[PDB]
Symmetry: C5
Subunit: 99 residues, 5 copies
């Protein structure tokens, strides 16, 4: 499951830890209100992947997307640290796992 | 099939929902009139992939090209939310599905 | 073979169409007289992939590069629309095909 | 094991050499205090991938992430030159191996 | 073996042609004097791939990094046009070959 490192970093914020998720859908949407990138788990949960224009978050967010797409393609599980303050919940950190 | 979330976001628009599309061709064309990115389906269907220079749509459009190609390479299915206004229809949201 | 859509766009131009090409070499060169990106087929034909710096062509040419490298790495045939008004002939449109 | 070249380079620095690492986790985090890119090995070790905004280090930093993500995806081991001072240690150079 | 085109092109220069090289290591280093992107063949040979900030060289050197990483990842061979003007030698042109 999540690395202690990951668990610990997450338990330090207001986000919630989601472990061993299997994403089966990857979404790109430029429609006015739904504008964004989302992922869907094999149990129907939906998450919004964070987006940033400025350095450095523009980097990590770009990596969150690669990680996300990689998971959908390979069937690799991921561990998330998502904030439940928005709907869909937004991903603040993501861990791809090969194991 | 398309995710409930995906459907939800598409129906609220004037675009039509296309499900379980098997993409077999990916095209990049720079000739004056057909200037664009397109994807053809196993059924002959053809869509144009939206283009954008500014943030943040430049991000989603880039993820759209990544998803399509991926579909072509992996023979993985996609659900689209496309505008029947243009010829070929333009992609406004797309969903890559593992299952 | 080449999608009808693909065939039609090529025909409206000065260029010509080449189908079912197996690309076996991908080339990057920065030499003074031959700097460029090229691909070579199983038969020994060579083409230059077009290049550009400004939007929106830089986007499409980048996609041409991606398509060419994917073909070489996976052995997936491509259909091209290339101008014989240069040597080697320049690619103006390219279609990646799984089917 | 590390190439003589890689080893020799790592030895001119205050950094230390780690060989044949098997990375199993790739992390993207945008949280206030944890913001950053990290990898975790099969043994439980954690390393932060360096970041840079300006040329040309933004290029190297970019390859490092790719090298890192590639290892996690394909399972190939990496040799790193990391600063043993910080926690997690910071990677300054990385070498991907196949053989 | 190298394409006639690639050979012709390299024989136009002062550099040397190196055919059928198996790349086994790929390096990214930001350390001061050793910063650069390097490739190591299965016989211990080392070459440097240059970095260019400006167009069009930022495009070509970027693809060289992709070919390099790819050759290392898939086991595919490459033919190089390399200059002894530096140590390690710089790659002026590179050809990924599936043939």
């Amino acid at each position: 499951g999540a690395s202690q490192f990951f668990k610990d970093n997450c338990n330090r914020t207001t986000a919630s830890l989601v472990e061993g998720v299997e994403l089966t859908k990857y979404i790109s949407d430029i429609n006015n209100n739904t504008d964004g990138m989302y992922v869907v788990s094999s149990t129907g949960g939906v998450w919004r992947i964070s987006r940033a224009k400025d350095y450095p978050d523009n980097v990590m967010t770009a990596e969150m997307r690669k990680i996300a797409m990689a998971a959908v393609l390979s069937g690799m599980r991921v561990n998330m640290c998502a904030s439940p303050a928005s709907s869909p919940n937004v991903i603040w950190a993501i861990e791809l796992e090969a194991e």
